[PDB]
Design an enzyme around this catalytic site. Structure first.
Site, PDB file in Angstrom:
ATOM      1  N   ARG A  45      -4.287  11.354   4.616  1.00  0.00           N
ATOM      2  CA  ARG A  45      -3.104  12.191   4.708  1.00  0.00           C
ATOM      3  C   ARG A  45      -2.216  12.132   3.456  1.00  0.00           C
ATOM      4  NH1 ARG A  45      -0.085  15.331   7.250  1.00  0.00           N
ATOM      5  NH2 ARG A  45       2.198  15.162   7.459  1.00  0.00           N
ATOM      6  N   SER A  57      12.031  12.268   6.441  1.00  0.00           N
ATOM      7  CA  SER A  57      10.621  12.046   6.125  1.00  0.00           C
ATOM      8  C   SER A  57      10.309  11.260   4.855  1.00  0.00           C
ATOM      9  CB  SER A  57       9.767  13.307   6.262  1.00  0.00           C
ATOM     10  OG  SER A  57       8.543  13.163   5.556  1.00  0.00           O
ATOM     11  N   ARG A 117      -1.317  17.272  11.752  1.00  0.00           N
ATOM     12  CA  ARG A 117      -0.055  16.713  11.318  1.00  0.00           C
ATOM     13  C   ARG A 117       0.752  17.605  10.393  1.00  0.00           C
ATOM     14  NH1 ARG A 117       2.369  14.978  14.947  1.00  0.00           N
ATOM     15  NH2 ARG A 117       1.108  16.828  15.436  1.00  0.00           N
ATOM     16  N   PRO A 118       1.977  17.982  10.784  1.00  0.00           N
ATOM     17  CA  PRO A 118       2.838  18.842   9.975  1.00  0.00           C
ATOM     18  C   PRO A 118       3.056  18.418   8.504  1.00  0.00           C
ATOM     19  CG  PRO A 118       3.678  18.743  12.181  1.00  0.00           C
ATOM     20  CD  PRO A 118       2.609  17.680  12.081  1.00  0.00           C
ATOM     21  N   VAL A 119       3.016  19.374   7.573  1.00  0.00           N
ATOM     22  CA  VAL A 119       3.321  19.144   6.148  1.00  0.00           C
ATOM     23  C   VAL A 119       4.328  20.183   5.780  1.00  0.00           C
ATOM     24  CG1 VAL A 119       1.330  20.555   5.457  1.00  0.00           C
ATOM     25  CG2 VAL A 119       1.455  18.167   4.761  1.00  0.00           C
ATOM     26  N   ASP A 120       4.911  20.792   6.804  1.00  0.00           N
ATOM     27  CA  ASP A 120       5.951  21.785   6.587  1.00  0.00           C
ATOM     28  C   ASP A 120       7.022  21.309   5.597  1.00  0.00           C
ATOM     29  OD1 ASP A 120       8.494  21.318   8.893  1.00  0.00           O
ATOM     30  OD2 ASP A 120       6.626  20.161   8.955  1.00  0.00           O
ATOM     31  N   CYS A 153      -3.665  23.991  10.865  1.00  0.00           N
ATOM     32  CA  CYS A 153      -3.650  24.938  11.947  1.00  0.00           C
ATOM     33  C   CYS A 153      -4.397  24.413  13.152  1.00  0.00           C
ATOM     34  CB  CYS A 153      -4.085  26.311  11.478  1.00  0.00           C
ATOM     35  SG  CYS A 153      -3.198  26.872  10.031  1.00  0.00           S
ATOM     36  N   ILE A 199      13.598   3.816  18.886  1.00  0.00           N
ATOM     37  CA  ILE A 199      13.202   5.131  18.395  1.00  0.00           C
ATOM     38  C   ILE A 199      11.828   5.576  18.882  1.00  0.00           C
ATOM     39  CG2 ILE A 199      12.714   6.528  16.342  1.00  0.00           C
ATOM     40  CD1 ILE A 199      15.656   5.834  16.640  1.00  0.00           C
ATOM     41  N   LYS A 229       0.849  -1.197   0.000  1.00  0.00           N
ATOM     42  CA  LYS A 229       0.000   0.000   0.000  1.00  0.00           C
ATOM     43  C   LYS A 229       0.883   1.246   0.000  1.00  0.00           C
ATOM     44  CE  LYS A 229      -2.868   1.778   3.522  1.00  0.00           C
ATOM     45  NZ  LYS A 229      -1.715   1.169   4.227  1.00  0.00           N
TER      46      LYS A 229
HETATM   47  O1  LIG Z   1       6.014  17.853   6.418  1.00  0.00           O
HETATM   48  C1  LIG Z   1       6.274  17.045   7.311  1.00  0.00           C
HETATM   49  C2  LIG Z   1       6.259  15.600   7.171  1.00  0.00           C
HETATM   50  C3  LIG Z   1       6.567  14.827   8.240  1.00  0.00           C
HETATM   51  N1  LIG Z   1       6.893  15.357   9.508  1.00  0.00           N
HETATM   52  C4  LIG Z   1       7.220  14.466  10.661  1.00  0.00           C
HETATM   53  O2  LIG Z   1       8.256  13.585  10.277  1.00  0.00           O
HETATM   54  C5  LIG Z   1       8.088  12.298  10.938  1.00  0.00           C
HETATM   55  C6  LIG Z   1       8.355  11.204   9.930  1.00  0.00           C
HETATM   56  O3  LIG Z   1       7.788  11.552   8.667  1.00  0.00           O
HETATM   57  P1  LIG Z   1       7.262  10.453   7.642  1.00  0.00           P
HETATM   58  O4  LIG Z   1       6.738  11.108   6.414  1.00  0.00           O
HETATM   59  O5  LIG Z   1       8.288   9.374   7.535  1.00  0.00           O
HETATM   60  O6  LIG Z   1       6.014   9.888   8.512  1.00  0.00           O
HETATM   61  P2  LIG Z   1       4.436   9.955   8.309  1.00  0.00           P
HETATM   62  O7  LIG Z   1       4.278  10.559   7.006  1.00  0.00           O
HETATM   63  O8  LIG Z   1       3.707   8.721   8.540  1.00  0.00           O
HETATM   64  O9  LIG Z   1       4.058  10.974   9.474  1.00  0.00           O
HETATM   65  P3  LIG Z   1       2.657  11.566   9.933  1.00  0.00           P
HETATM   66  O10 LIG Z   1       1.567  11.017   9.012  1.00  0.00           O
HETATM   67  O11 LIG Z   1       2.442  11.108  11.388  1.00  0.00           O
HETATM   68  O12 LIG Z   1       2.834  13.060   9.774  1.00  0.00           O
HETATM   69  C7  LIG Z   1       6.668  12.247  11.486  1.00  0.00           C
HETATM   70  O13 LIG Z   1       6.729  12.144  12.908  1.00  0.00           O
HETATM   71  C8  LIG Z   1       6.038  13.558  11.062  1.00  0.00           C
HETATM   72  O14 LIG Z   1       5.233  14.133  12.060  1.00  0.00           O
HETATM   73  C9  LIG Z   1       6.933  16.766   9.714  1.00  0.00           C
HETATM   74  O15 LIG Z   1       7.208  17.290  10.783  1.00  0.00           O
HETATM   75  N2  LIG Z   1       6.607  17.522   8.591  1.00  0.00           N
END
Ligand SMILES: O=c1ccn([C@@H]2O[C@H](COP(=O)(O)OP(=O)(O)OP(=O)(O)O)[C@@H](O)[C@H]2O)c(=O)[nH]1
Length: 419
Positions: free
Chosen positions: A91, A162, A120-123, A115, A327, A22
């Site tokens: 997501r 990430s 969940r951050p997408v920064d 916000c 981790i 997946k």
């Molecule tokens: O734009 C981003 C993407 C990822 N992350 C952070 O990097 C880590 C690993 O990023 P990953 O991209 O490997 O994990 P994930 O997509 O499953 O994470 P989430 O759905 O929980 O967001 C995660 O803990 C995530 O919160 C950011 O801070 N910003």
């Protein structure tokens, strides 16, 4: 509310065909937005997220159809925005952003909150695209990216590793002008797969699977046929299913090289293992597993996605074994459930001390985690009497009809309702 009713004990033996991953299928489906020519995505599992992605793609203007494959035609993507209604439960939606701006010069994706407290951050996605020359537009609940012409190759150092962001940056870079270097890129097999898909389309990429990915921008991506890699975690789950039941199993459509750590770990447990180019065999010779010591760590080390499974293993193995999560914290929530099944263990900090027992006892259990959930079902298989695993929708989202696979293996299992 769907539930799994399992009657044990039963030896899990025979054959199983591994479904496509997946986690590779998704980023590849979104990358197909870059394809100017029709594409055939083979080995795509039938899962909720896939359905959601197909809908999303259609909404964009791409022709989409499916079966074992997912046929895509992104020659004419007219719509450049992923609406709230279509991304609300997924997501992975963010993956539409990169391809859009890189191929069409513009993209917009809806964000529930972003916000919102706890969102969940997408920064990483946003900032990575920015490094690529994209102009970013930010307003609570959405993200817009645009560029006048082609994106521009850049040297991007990731302060945080990430998987998601690596896919976005890598994907968009295939169309930028020049070379793009991603430092601290995610190593996952799923990343190598997506990268390979891209290259199959004409992209220029190297270093996939290592800490540094180098992308050379090209004119356009074509079409063709691509086979999504086998689900590594699913394969692991089936291997354990046999290892904890004194059984013998052959996994078809597998990829041994994505499981080095898991395979060696199984050998430590006393398993007799064989591998081919597209297959893996496990034989307990009717024997009980040996307790092992496990340390989860970043790929290619022992995967945290195999933890719950190995915990179960230790719990019915000969001797004592400790499993350490180096981790991730709080990965033992399911353990109490197993103890309710007659298991013997102690949770200490980032570890679980296992004391193998002869036979587990059926019980009513539940876990929110898909791996932990699946470990519960496996437990039900070898446990004495009736086991009822609640809320199996979690399993349904990541496993392609595990019920049917288990049954072919000799499991007494039924999908039931009870409310
Ligand atoms: O734009 C981003 C993407 C990822 N992350 C952070 O990097 C880590 C690993 O990023 P990953 O991209 O490997 O994990 P994930 O997509 O499953 O994470 P989430 O759905 O929980 O967001 C995660 O803990 C995530 O919160 C950011 O801070 N910003």
């Amino acid at each position: 509310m769907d539930k799994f009713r399992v009657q044990g004990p039963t030896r899990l033996q025979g054959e199983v065909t591994i479904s496509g991953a997946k986690n590779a299928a998704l980023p590849i489906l979104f990358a197909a937005l870059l394809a100017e020519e029709p594409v055939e995505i083979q080995n795509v599992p039938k899962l909720k997220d896939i359905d959601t992605t197909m809908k999303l793609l259609t909404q964009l203007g791409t022709k989409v159809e499916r079966x074992g494959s997912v046929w895509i035609d992104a020659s004419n993507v007219n719509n450049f925005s992923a609406p709230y209604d279509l991304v609300k439960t997924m997501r992975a939606s963010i993956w539409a952003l990169g391809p859009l701006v890189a191929r069409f010069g513009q993209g917009q994706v809806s964000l529930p909150g972003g916000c919102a407290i706890g969102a969940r951050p997408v920064d990483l996605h946003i900032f990575g695209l920015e490094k690529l020359g994209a102009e970013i537009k930010l307003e609570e609940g959405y993200v817009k990216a645009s560029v006048n012409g082609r994106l521009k190759g850049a040297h991007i150092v990731m302060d945080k590793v990430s998987v998601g962001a690596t896919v976005t940056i890598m994907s968009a870079a295939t169309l930028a002008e020049g070379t793009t270097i991603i430092e601290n890129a995610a190593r996952e097999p799923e990343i190598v797969d997506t990268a390979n898909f891209l290259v199959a389309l004409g992209a220029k990429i190297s270093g996939q699977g290592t800490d540094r990915i180098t992308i050379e921008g090209v004119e356009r991506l074509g079409g063709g046929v691509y086979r999504v890699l086998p689900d590594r975690i699913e394969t692991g789950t089936f291997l354990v299913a046999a290892a904890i039941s004194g059984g013998k199993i052959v996994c078809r459509n597998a990829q041994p090289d994505t499981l080095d750590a898991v395979l060696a770990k199984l050998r430590e447990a006393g398993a007799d293992i064989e591998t081919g180019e597209d297959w893996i065999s496990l034989d307990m010779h009717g024997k009980r597993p040996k307790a092992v010591t496990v340390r989860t760590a970043p790929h290619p080390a022992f995967p945290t996605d195999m933890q719950a499974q190995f915990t179960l293993l230790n719990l019915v193995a000969e001797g004592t074994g400790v499993i350490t999560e180096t981790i991730f914290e709080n990965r033992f929530m399911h353990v109490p459930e197993l103890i309710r099944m007659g298991a013997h263990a102690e949770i200490e900090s980032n570890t679980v001390i296992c004391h193998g027992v002869e036979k587990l006892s059926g019980a009513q259990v539940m876990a929110t985690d898909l791996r932990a959930s699946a470990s519960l079902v496996l437990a039900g298989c070898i446990a004495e009497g009736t086991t009822v695993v609640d809320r199996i929708y979690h399993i349904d989202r990541g496993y392609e009809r595990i019920e049917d696979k288990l049954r072919a293996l000799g499991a007494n299992i039924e999908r039931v309702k009870g409310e």
